[PDB]
Design a protein around this nucleic acid. Structure first.
Ligand SMILES: [Mg+2]
Ligand SMILES: [Mg+2]
Ligand SMILES: [Mg+2]
Ligand SMILES: [Mg+2]
Ligand SMILES: [Mg+2]
Ligand SMILES: [Mg+2]
Ligand SMILES: [Mg+2]
Ligand SMILES: [Mg+2]
Ligand SMILES: [Mg+2]
Ligand SMILES: [Mg+2]
Ligand SMILES: [Mg+2]
Ligand SMILES: [Mg+2]
Ligand SMILES: [Mg+2]
Ligand SMILES: [Mg+2]
Ligand SMILES: [Mg+2]
Ligand SMILES: [Mg+2]
Ligand SMILES: [Mg+2]
Ligand SMILES: [Mg+2]
Ligand SMILES: [Mg+2]
Ligand SMILES: [Mg+2]
Ligand SMILES: [Mg+2]
Ligand SMILES: [Mg+2]
Ligand SMILES: [Mg+2]
Ligand SMILES: [Mg+2]
Ligand SMILES: [Mg+2]
Ligand SMILES: [Mg+2]
Ligand SMILES: [Mg+2]
Ligand SMILES: [Mg+2]
Ligand SMILES: [Mg+2]
Ligand SMILES: [Mg+2]
Ligand SMILES: [Mg+2]
Ligand SMILES: [Mg+2]
Ligand SMILES: [Mg+2]
Ligand SMILES: [Mg+2]
Ligand SMILES: [Mg+2]
Ligand SMILES: [Mg+2]
Ligand SMILES: [Mg+2]
Ligand SMILES: [Mg+2]
Ligand SMILES: [Mg+2]
Ligand SMILES: [Mg+2]
Ligand SMILES: [Mg+2]
Ligand SMILES: [Mg+2]
Ligand SMILES: [Mg+2]
Ligand SMILES: [Mg+2]
Ligand SMILES: [Mg+2]
Ligand SMILES: [Mg+2]
Ligand SMILES: [Mg+2]
Ligand SMILES: [Mg+2]
Ligand SMILES: [Mg+2]
Ligand SMILES: [Mg+2]
Ligand SMILES: [Mg+2]
Ligand SMILES: [Mg+2]
Ligand SMILES: [Mg+2]
Ligand SMILES: [Mg+2]
Ligand SMILES: [Mg+2]
Ligand SMILES: [Mg+2]
Ligand SMILES: [Mg+2]
Ligand SMILES: [Mg+2]
Ligand SMILES: [Mg+2]
Ligand SMILES: [Mg+2]
Ligand SMILES: [Mg+2]
Ligand SMILES: [Mg+2]
Ligand SMILES: [Mg+2]
Ligand SMILES: [Mg+2]
Ligand SMILES: [Mg+2]
Ligand SMILES: [Mg+2]
Ligand SMILES: [Mg+2]
Ligand SMILES: [Mg+2]
Ligand SMILES: [Mg+2]
Ligand SMILES: [Mg+2]
Ligand SMILES: [Mg+2]
Ligand SMILES: [Mg+2]
Ligand SMILES: [Mg+2]
Ligand SMILES: [Mg+2]
Ligand SMILES: [Mg+2]
Ligand SMILES: [Mg+2]
Ligand SMILES: [Mg+2]
Ligand SMILES: [Mg+2]
Ligand SMILES: [Mg+2]
Ligand SMILES: [Mg+2]
Ligand SMILES: [Mg+2]
Ligand SMILES: [Mg+2]
Ligand SMILES: [Mg+2]
Ligand SMILES: [Mg+2]
Ligand SMILES: [Mg+2]
Ligand SMILES: [Mg+2]
Ligand SMILES: [Mg+2]
Ligand SMILES: [Mg+2]
Ligand SMILES: [Mg+2]
Ligand SMILES: [Mg+2]
Ligand SMILES: [Mg+2]
Ligand SMILES: [Mg+2]
Ligand SMILES: [Mg+2]
Ligand SMILES: [Mg+2]
Ligand SMILES: [Mg+2]
Ligand SMILES: [Mg+2]
Ligand SMILES: [Mg+2]
Ligand SMILES: [Mg+2]
Ligand SMILES: [Mg+2]
Ligand SMILES: [Mg+2]
Ligand SMILES: [Mg+2]
Ligand SMILES: [Mg+2]
Ligand SMILES: [Mg+2]
Ligand SMILES: [Mg+2]
Ligand SMILES: [Mg+2]
Ligand SMILES: [Mg+2]
Ligand SMILES: [Mg+2]
Ligand SMILES: [Mg+2]
Ligand SMILES: [Mg+2]
Ligand SMILES: [Mg+2]
Ligand SMILES: [Mg+2]
Ligand SMILES: [Mg+2]
Ligand SMILES: [Mg+2]
Ligand SMILES: [Mg+2]
Ligand SMILES: [Mg+2]
Ligand SMILES: [Mg+2]
Ligand SMILES: [Mg+2]
Ligand SMILES: [Mg+2]
Ligand SMILES: [Mg+2]
Ligand SMILES: [Mg+2]
Ligand SMILES: [Mg+2]
Ligand SMILES: [Mg+2]
Ligand SMILES: [Mg+2]
Ligand SMILES: [Mg+2]
Ligand SMILES: [Mg+2]
Ligand SMILES: [Mg+2]
Ligand SMILES: [Mg+2]
Ligand SMILES: [Mg+2]
Ligand SMILES: [Mg+2]
Ligand SMILES: [Mg+2]
Ligand SMILES: [Mg+2]
Ligand SMILES: [Mg+2]
Ligand SMILES: [Mg+2]
Ligand SMILES: [Mg+2]
Ligand SMILES: [Mg+2]
Ligand SMILES: [Mg+2]
Ligand SMILES: [Mg+2]
Ligand SMILES: [Mg+2]
Ligand SMILES: [Mg+2]
Ligand SMILES: [Mg+2]
Ligand SMILES: [Mg+2]
Ligand SMILES: [Mg+2]
Ligand SMILES: [Mg+2]
Ligand SMILES: [Mg+2]
Ligand SMILES: [Mg+2]
Ligand SMILES: [Mg+2]
Ligand SMILES: [Mg+2]
Ligand SMILES: [Mg+2]
Ligand SMILES: [Mg+2]
Ligand SMILES: [Mg+2]
Ligand SMILES: [Mg+2]
Ligand SMILES: [Mg+2]
Ligand SMILES: [Mg+2]
Ligand SMILES: [Mg+2]
Ligand SMILES: [Mg+2]
Ligand SMILES: [Mg+2]
Ligand SMILES: [Mg+2]
Ligand SMILES: [Mg+2]
Ligand SMILES: [Mg+2]
Ligand SMILES: [Mg+2]
Ligand SMILES: [Mg+2]
Ligand SMILES: [Mg+2]
Ligand SMILES: [Mg+2]
Ligand SMILES: [Mg+2]
Ligand SMILES: [Mg+2]
Ligand SMILES: [Mg+2]
Ligand SMILES: [Mg+2]
Ligand SMILES: [Mg+2]
Ligand SMILES: [Mg+2]
Ligand SMILES: [Mg+2]
Ligand SMILES: [Mg+2]
Ligand SMILES: [Mg+2]
Ligand SMILES: [Mg+2]
Ligand SMILES: [Mg+2]
Ligand SMILES: [Mg+2]
Ligand SMILES: [Mg+2]
Ligand SMILES: [Mg+2]
Ligand SMILES: [Mg+2]
Ligand SMILES: [Mg+2]
Ligand SMILES: [Mg+2]
Ligand SMILES: [Mg+2]
Ligand SMILES: [Mg+2]
Ligand SMILES: [Mg+2]
Ligand SMILES: [Mg+2]
Ligand SMILES: [Mg+2]
Ligand SMILES: [Mg+2]
Ligand SMILES: [Mg+2]
Ligand SMILES: [Mg+2]
Ligand SMILES: [Mg+2]
Ligand SMILES: [Mg+2]
Ligand SMILES: [Mg+2]
Ligand SMILES: [Mg+2]
Ligand SMILES: [Mg+2]
Ligand SMILES: [Mg+2]
Ligand SMILES: [Mg+2]
Ligand SMILES: [Mg+2]
Ligand SMILES: [Mg+2]
Ligand SMILES: [Mg+2]
Ligand SMILES: [Mg+2]
Ligand SMILES: [Mg+2]
Ligand SMILES: [Mg+2]
Ligand SMILES: [Mg+2]
Ligand SMILES: [Mg+2]
Ligand SMILES: [Mg+2]
Ligand SMILES: [Mg+2]
Ligand SMILES: [Mg+2]
Ligand SMILES: [Mg+2]
Ligand SMILES: [Mg+2]
Ligand SMILES: [Mg+2]
Ligand SMILES: [Mg+2]
Ligand SMILES: [Mg+2]
Ligand SMILES: [Mg+2]
Ligand SMILES: [Mg+2]
Ligand SMILES: [Mg+2]
Ligand SMILES: [Mg+2]
Ligand SMILES: [Mg+2]
Ligand SMILES: [Zn+2]
Lengths: 140, 101, 59, 154, 112, 116
RNA sequence: GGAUGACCCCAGGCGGUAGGGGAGCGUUCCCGAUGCCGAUGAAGGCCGACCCGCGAGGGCGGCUGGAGGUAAGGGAAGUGC
RNA sequence: GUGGAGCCUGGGAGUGAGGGCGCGAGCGAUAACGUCCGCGUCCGAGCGCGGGAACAACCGAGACCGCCAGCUAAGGCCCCC
RNA sequence: CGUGAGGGAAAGGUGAAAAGAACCCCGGGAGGGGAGUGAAAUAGAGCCUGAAACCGUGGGCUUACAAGCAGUCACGGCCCCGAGGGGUUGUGGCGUGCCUAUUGAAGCAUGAGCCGGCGACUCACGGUCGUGGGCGAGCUUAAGCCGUUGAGGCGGAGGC
């Protein structure tokens, strides 16, 4: 009788506070929210998930010796251009990239997945500029 | 009111006034059939376990047809295997008269 | 050398994409202040033979 | 490819030309070459059993008899060569030209008179054959041709 | 009203003359004349002649006014090519195609 | 008698070319490229007619999962509870109720909790 | 089942290269045809989201075309790229 | 034990380059995507489907067509999924 | 083409009738626009029909953050014809061209630029099985002869 398809939804803005949470276990939930799979009307081919703001992204937490042994790498395309940055240095320099990298590695590849990444707004420290959107705080 | 019925091995939300194609039923056009009911909804709300005892949906058979033709084609590479099959799925077109329940 | 050669025929799409830079620009033309005819700037008017207010060339 | 007009010269060397290998241009893979298994003059005749053709002859006449379309005539009173003469006769015998007629008679004047009518096929009894019987809707015969028929199917 | 001229079998490659025709498509007759007069292409000569022919058709045969005329449509079609031998090194002959063009100009009246 | 090709091949080719309308480049214009593309197209439609059934079931399941969690239980428990309740509304209609009739779906969640 | 393909019922089989077998489509030509279709438009061409057929194909309708075509049933092959 | 079982007579073949894997041996070096046999399997011809990141022969399973229905198999159930 | 012996092409169709387009216009001409002829002039001589590759003009939809054997399944947007259909494709799912040869190919192994047309299991005689009919301890003629002029019969030598 033809599956329901929603008309363009009005997206919800939620707020998550990352302080003390485990890096991967939180990414996994931000991925779900960005994909909008918590919504009973979920549709695989439209951006209809939530917008997710995150504060205290520099106070994310991690187990074991990952602060020293977790190595992000970037390849520049040039001979010898494989750069190695440990998690310690990344938190010290570009802390918001840590949760961003982890969320992005759990989103789908392709056009839609890159757009849902743009619906994530990651911030170091407790403040965020999206007061305009009035984000509903979420206990995850 | 609405009703979830079962016919042709499939399930359908129906309401009075609805035209619906289902697998081909054995009835002459213009007669009425009764469909089993798994759930009633809307005003009242009744849940089959699995079928609701008293319930029924009366529907007039408008007539029978063959679906638009589908090209069933098969091909195996490097083996000169080609098959072309034309398929038209039979059906009955029903109008939902009333949800009895 | 070993005689390089096209590996694949260029598609109608790619051949015409290459030619997206081939359109002609129209000539730059200005009215001649003497006879009102359209002529290239900084050239003697080929219609009345005037340039810089005076007659230079028989036309 | 042997009866065609070109010579048996090999048009270019076997190898190192960058082209497909070929012999002579009479080969059937060339436009204008020989043709591989085209028709040759043939005799399509064959000896059907004498008894089979005799049986067919008698059966084909029996068919018209069983139908009511076999007529035997004493002679052809009026007709002496002229088409209108035979036409007059055929009108008295229920032959209006609404049905095709195989006319079997040894009388040549009768045969000359009818043979131009579109609905009539003419034969001498010695030419009685089943194809002309089955071709036509009616069978009209001399008693002298009826006699010849009886002699041949015996 | 529309008026048309066609120059058929002009001995020039269609691709070259099309560059010229693209300049005047949609142009008023007067702008097209000035554009063709200072276009440094062999094909300006051929395109001009068909443009002027069609404008003479528009005035003389079709009750259209000169000062209203613009190039409502124009296009170049390929005629039959003249095939010619070009001798090369090593006993090899190439085939040069000297392409031909059909040149169409269609004029309308821009009421303004 | 001679029986040249005549009309036969141009008419076969045109059938195929018609079926290939819309394809890119020579795949809609060359008989040969069209035919190769259509061999693939037929096989994909067969395989995707099979796959469409699986695709839609999975969309129903994800939606049902979201509707369930709004009530503090997950899909796998809902389904087992419906089983013990003997309810046989399928995933196509579960999903639809889950969207169009939240109140009826909630009733169905209660049945599934009550039947553990 | 009815009674010798009259159609229905229920049941089971139906991946496939070399290869065996069966049933069909279409092309050219012959009988059918001194016929029949045809300028109120033959063949061929170009479209079609319509009809029939599992399919090869066959219809039908619109445009082009401008003089041929050819049934039911059979026969013969230079018969399908 | 009624099975695309078996036996008999005859028409038509194709095949007579196999390969991987498990087990059993020989050769090799208790080497080889190695070689050679035996029993079995699969690919070959199932490069059709699910799992195994991808992958003829490992695991699951023998695709007649259709369904926006249900149950399972290997394998899975934090996100990509 | 070859010194020569010798090799050896391509190329048919206006219309019923030339009535083959006077004259005017643009243009050096070619060519075209009108007029005129004709049932028809995209039958105008580069002439019946006029497919395909190939080229162009105009319109609808679409495309400059995007990863592709080019499709397919789904949904949405726009355009078109009027509880439907067609065209288009943004996103999502899936997805290793065809043929050939191989143990095994998307395969970085063969062949193919693309289209149209030509292009390969036949015929004679014998044999051997099966099959449709005729006759049956018998069956059958060959060459010829007569007849016919798309008529069929005779002929027993001979063969099984
Ligand atoms: Mg619905
Ligand atoms: Mg957390
Ligand atoms: Mg989303
Ligand atoms: Mg989504
Ligand atoms: Mg640590
Ligand atoms: Mg993926
Ligand atoms: Mg249906
Ligand atoms: Mg049905
Ligand atoms: Mg009932
Ligand atoms: Mg298919
Ligand atoms: Mg395949
Ligand atoms: Mg295969
Ligand atoms: Mg292949
Ligand atoms: Mg393949
Ligand atoms: Mg093959
Ligand atoms: Mg193979
Ligand atoms: Mg194949
Ligand atoms: Mg096969
Ligand atoms: Mg099959
Ligand atoms: Mg096909
Ligand atoms: Mg070199
Ligand atoms: Mg060098
Ligand atoms: Mg050098
Ligand atoms: Mg070079
Ligand atoms: Mg290449
Ligand atoms: Mg190239
Ligand atoms: Mg190409
Ligand atoms: Mg293109
Ligand atoms: Mg183009
Ligand atoms: Mg390019
Ligand atoms: Mg360039
Ligand atoms: Mg320009
Ligand atoms: Mg000026
Ligand atoms: Mg010879
Ligand atoms: Mg010769
Ligand atoms: Mg000769
Ligand atoms: Mg010779
Ligand atoms: Mg010879
Ligand atoms: Mg020779
Ligand atoms: Mg020789
Ligand atoms: Mg050679
Ligand atoms: Mg060679
Ligand atoms: Mg070459
Ligand atoms: Mg060659
Ligand atoms: Mg060649
Ligand atoms: Mg040869
Ligand atoms: Mg030659
Ligand atoms: Mg020869
Ligand atoms: Mg010849
Ligand atoms: Mg031969
Ligand atoms: Mg030969
Ligand atoms: Mg013959
Ligand atoms: Mg024979
Ligand atoms: Mg005898
Ligand atoms: Mg007569
Ligand atoms: Mg006569
Ligand atoms: Mg007759
Ligand atoms: Mg006669
Ligand atoms: Mg006669
Ligand atoms: Mg006679
Ligand atoms: Mg006679
Ligand atoms: Mg009769
Ligand atoms: Mg130029
Ligand atoms: Mg210039
Ligand atoms: Mg001029
Ligand atoms: Mg003028
Ligand atoms: Mg040179
Ligand atoms: Mg040179
Ligand atoms: Mg030289
Ligand atoms: Mg060239
Ligand atoms: Mg050239
Ligand atoms: Mg040319
Ligand atoms: Mg032109
Ligand atoms: Mg042929
Ligand atoms: Mg032909
Ligand atoms: Mg053809
Ligand atoms: Mg055609
Ligand atoms: Mg096409
Ligand atoms: Mg097309
Ligand atoms: Mg398309
Ligand atoms: Mg195309
Ligand atoms: Mg094309
Ligand atoms: Mg296919
Ligand atoms: Mg496949
Ligand atoms: Mg399928
Ligand atoms: Mg599939
Ligand atoms: Mg399934
Ligand atoms: Mg969910
Ligand atoms: Mg269960
Ligand atoms: Mg269920
Ligand atoms: Mg709603
Ligand atoms: Mg059955
Ligand atoms: Mg069975
Ligand atoms: Mg069955
Ligand atoms: Mg089979
Ligand atoms: Mg003939
Ligand atoms: Mg005749
Ligand atoms: Mg008539
Ligand atoms: Mg008439
Ligand atoms: Mg014909
Ligand atoms: Mg036609
Ligand atoms: Mg079929
Ligand atoms: Mg058709
Ligand atoms: Mg009509
Ligand atoms: Mg027609
Ligand atoms: Mg005639
Ligand atoms: Mg015929
Ligand atoms: Mg017939
Ligand atoms: Mg042949
Ligand atoms: Mg045949
Ligand atoms: Mg064919
Ligand atoms: Mg068997
Ligand atoms: Mg067997
Ligand atoms: Mg067997
Ligand atoms: Mg045995
Ligand atoms: Mg046996
Ligand atoms: Mg045997
Ligand atoms: Mg055989
Ligand atoms: Mg062999
Ligand atoms: Mg051997
Ligand atoms: Mg084996
Ligand atoms: Mg072996
Ligand atoms: Mg061996
Ligand atoms: Mg092995
Ligand atoms: Mg392997
Ligand atoms: Mg092994
Ligand atoms: Mg083991
Ligand atoms: Mg041993
Ligand atoms: Mg060692
Ligand atoms: Mg080995
Ligand atoms: Mg080993
Ligand atoms: Mg070993
Ligand atoms: Mg083995
Ligand atoms: Mg297998
Ligand atoms: Mg495979
Ligand atoms: Mg593969
Ligand atoms: Mg294989
Ligand atoms: Mg697999
Ligand atoms: Mg897999
Ligand atoms: Mg793996
Ligand atoms: Mg594999
Ligand atoms: Mg497999
Ligand atoms: Mg296995
Ligand atoms: Mg196991
Ligand atoms: Mg099976
Ligand atoms: Mg299967
Ligand atoms: Mg099965
Ligand atoms: Mg289950
Ligand atoms: Mg399990
Ligand atoms: Mg996992
Ligand atoms: Mg991923
Ligand atoms: Mg993945
Ligand atoms: Mg999930
Ligand atoms: Mg010479
Ligand atoms: Mg020489
Ligand atoms: Mg000479
Ligand atoms: Mg020679
Ligand atoms: Mg010639
Ligand atoms: Mg012609
Ligand atoms: Mg003529
Ligand atoms: Mg006439
Ligand atoms: Mg004059
Ligand atoms: Mg004049
Ligand atoms: Mg002048
Ligand atoms: Mg003048
Ligand atoms: Mg001069
Ligand atoms: Mg002139
Ligand atoms: Mg003109
Ligand atoms: Mg003129
Ligand atoms: Mg007139
Ligand atoms: Mg004219
Ligand atoms: Mg025409
Ligand atoms: Mg004409
Ligand atoms: Mg004519
Ligand atoms: Mg023509
Ligand atoms: Mg033409
Ligand atoms: Mg044309
Ligand atoms: Mg064309
Ligand atoms: Mg054009
Ligand atoms: Mg365009
Ligand atoms: Mg446009
Ligand atoms: Mg980006
Ligand atoms: Mg964009
Ligand atoms: Mg892209
Ligand atoms: Mg895109
Ligand atoms: Mg494809
Ligand atoms: Mg896609
Ligand atoms: Mg979907
Ligand atoms: Mg649509
Ligand atoms: Mg769509
Ligand atoms: Mg877009
Ligand atoms: Mg993919
Ligand atoms: Mg691929
Ligand atoms: Mg193929
Ligand atoms: Mg080989
Ligand atoms: Mg090899
Ligand atoms: Mg093999
Ligand atoms: Mg290569
Ligand atoms: Mg390649
Ligand atoms: Mg090689
Ligand atoms: Mg290759
Ligand atoms: Mg080789
Ligand atoms: Mg090959
Ligand atoms: Mg070539
Ligand atoms: Mg070439
Ligand atoms: Mg092409
Ligand atoms: Mg071809
Ligand atoms: Mg044979
Ligand atoms: Mg032969
Ligand atoms: Mg024969
Ligand atoms: Mg024989
Ligand atoms: Mg024999
Ligand atoms: Mg034989
Ligand atoms: Mg026999
Ligand atoms: Mg006999
Ligand atoms: Mg007997
Ligand atoms: Zn001036």
């Amino acid at each position: 009788m033809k599956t329901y398809v929603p008309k363009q939804v009005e997206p919800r803005w939620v707020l998550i506070d990352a302080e003390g949470k485990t890096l991967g276990r939180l990414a996994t939930k931000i991925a779900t929210l960005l994909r909008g799979k918590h919504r009973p009307d979920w549709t695989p081919n439209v951006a209809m998930g939530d917008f997710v703001v995150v504060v205290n992204a520099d106070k994310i937490r991690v187990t074991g010796k990952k602060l020293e042994q977790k190595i992000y790498t970037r390849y520049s395309g040039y001979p010898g251009g494989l750069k190695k940055i440990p998690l310690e240095k990344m938190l010290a320099t570009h802390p918001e990239r840590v949760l961003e990298h982890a969320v992005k590695g759990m989103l789908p590849k392709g056009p839609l997945g890159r757009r849902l990444f743009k619906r994530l707004k990651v911030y170091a420290g407790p403040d965020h500029p999206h007061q305009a959107q009035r984000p509903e705080k979420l206990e995850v | 009111m609405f009703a979830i019925v079962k016919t042709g091995g499939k399930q359908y939300r129906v309401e009075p006034g609805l035209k619906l194609r289902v697998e081909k039923l054995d009835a002459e056009p213009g007669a009425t059939v009764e469909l089993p009911v798994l759930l009633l909804g809307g005003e009242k709300t009744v849940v089959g376990t699995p079928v609701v005892e008293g319930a029924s949906v009366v529907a007039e058979v408008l007539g029978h047809g063959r679906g638009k033709k589908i090209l069933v084609s098969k091909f195996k590479a490097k083996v000169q295997y080609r098959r072309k099959k034309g398929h038209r799925q039979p059906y009955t077109e029903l109008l939902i008269k009333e949800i009895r329940g | 050398a070993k005689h390089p050669v096209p590996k694949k025929k260029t598609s109608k799409a790619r051949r015409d994409a290459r030619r997206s830079h081939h359109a002609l620009t129209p000539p730059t033309l200005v009215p001649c202040p003497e006879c009102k005819a359209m002529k290239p700037p900084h050239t003697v008017c080929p219609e009345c033979g005037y340039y810089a207010g005076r007659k230079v060339l028989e036309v | 490819r042997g009866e065609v007009a070109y010579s048996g010269r090999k048009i270019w060397p076997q190898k190192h030309t960058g082209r497909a290998r070929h012999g002579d241009i009479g080969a059937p893979i060339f436009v204008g070459g020989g043709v591989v298994f085209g028709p040759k003059p043939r005799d399509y005749s064959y000896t059907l059993p004498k008894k089979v053709r005799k049986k067919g002859l008698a059966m084909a006449v029996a068919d018209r008899a069983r139908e009511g379309k076999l007529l035997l005539v004493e002679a052809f009173a009026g007709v002496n060569g002229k088409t209108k003469e035979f036409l007059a006769w055929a009108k008295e015998a229920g032959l209006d030209g609404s049905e095709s007629v195989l006319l079997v008679t040894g009388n040549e004047l009768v045969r000359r008179a009818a043979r131009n009518l579109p609905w009539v096929v003419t034969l001498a009894p010695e030419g009685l054959n089943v194809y002309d019987i089955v071709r036509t809707e009616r069978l009209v015969m001399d008693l002298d041709a009826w006699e010849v028929f009886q002699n041949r199917i015996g | 009203m529309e008026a048309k001229a066609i120059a058929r079998y002009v001995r020039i490659s269609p691709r070259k003359v099309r560059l010229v025709v693209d300049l005047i498509r949609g142009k008023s007759l007067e702008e097209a004349r000035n554009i063709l007069r200072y276009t440094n292409k062999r094909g300006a000569y051929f395109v001009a002649k068909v443009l002027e022919s069609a404008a003479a058709n528009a005035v003389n045969n079709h009750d259209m006014l000169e000062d209203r005329l613009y190039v409502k449509a124009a296009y170049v079609d390929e005629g039959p090519a003249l095939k010619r031998v070009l001798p090369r090194a090593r006993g090899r002959a190439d085939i040069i195609k000297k392409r031909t063009s059909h040149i169409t100009v269609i004029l309308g009246e821009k009421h303004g | 008698p001679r029986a040249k090709t005549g009309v036969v091949r141009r008419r076969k080719h045109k059938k195929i070319l018609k079926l290939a309308k819309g394809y890119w480049g020579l795949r809609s214009k060359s008989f040969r490229k069209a035919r190769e593309t259509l061999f693939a197209a037929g096989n994909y439609a067969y395989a995707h007619r099979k796959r469409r059934k699986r695709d839609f079931r999975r969309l129903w399941i994800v939606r049902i999962n979201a509707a369930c969690r709004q009530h503090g239980l997950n899909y796998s428990t809902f389904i087992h509870g419906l089983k013990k309740a003997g309810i046989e509304v399928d995933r196509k209609n579960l999903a639809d109720l889950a969207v169009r009739e939240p109140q009826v779906f909630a009733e169905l969640v209660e049945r599934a909790k009550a039947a553990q």
